């Protein structure tokens, strides 16, 4: 889903600086990645095999 | 292999959504027949005239949002169909709908 963030912006040389800026911000749930396999590749003169 | 009788509170307001006005109360009864066929298992479903009145009591497009029903399963005789069982859905009235769940009626 998506939420706001009230964020302090430390970017000098702008109207944006030293003020709070609300930005549209997505949330992506990322469970941990369980490792199973290993794949090897050979550089062929037609590509990758 | 039984002759059992249960009760349900079918939610017609969420079994009908996005359906037009002139074809709403028939889709209510098609969905009641499909719900009876799914629950009690037999394809033969007979619904009563009291349940007909209870569905069609408020026109074609103001279908009531929930109806308490009682599903009995009986056997068929006298040169019967290949489906020997049939679900006779009957209507039982109740004032309120909250805290009412599925009851096996003796």
């Amino acid at each position: 889903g998506m939420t706001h963030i009230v964020r302090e912006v430390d970017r000098p040389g702008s109207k944006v600086n030293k003020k709070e800026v609300v930005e549209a911000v997505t949330i992506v749930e990322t469970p941990p990645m369980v490792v199973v396999g290993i794949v090897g590749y050979v550089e062929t003169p037609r590509g990758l095999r | 292999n039984e002759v059992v009788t249960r009760e349900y509170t079918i939610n017609i307001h969420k079994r009908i959504h996005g359906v037009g006005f002139k074809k709403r109360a028939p889709r209510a009864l098609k969905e009641i027949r499909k719900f009876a066929m799914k629950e009690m298992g037999t394809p033969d479903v007979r619904i009563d005239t009291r349940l007909n009145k209870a569905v069609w009591a408020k026109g074609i497009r103001n279908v009531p949002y929930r109806i308490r029903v009682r599903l009995s399963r009986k056997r068929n005789e006298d040169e019967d169909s290949p489906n020997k069982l049939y679900t006779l859905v009957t209507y039982v009235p109740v004032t309120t709908f909250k805290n009412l769940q599925t009851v096996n009626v003796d």
Binding site: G1, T3, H4, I5, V6, R7, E8, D10, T30 | -
Partner: protein, 49 residues
């Protein structure tokens, strides 16, 4: 989510952000409240209590 295949500073990357407020309002409609305790403290007792 893939790592960027090129390297850029551009004053767009590597800024130590300061998150201040992330709203968790009712996204199922118009959100009025932040937390459940704050909603109960604003409204008060009902028939359920």
């Amino acid at each position: 989510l893939r790592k960027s295949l090129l390297v850029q500073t551009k004053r767009r990357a590597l800024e130590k952000i300061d998150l201040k407020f992330i709203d968790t309002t009712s996204k199922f409609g118009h959100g009025r409240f932040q937390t459940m305790e704050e909603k109960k403290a604003f409204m008060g007792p009902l028939k359920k209590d």
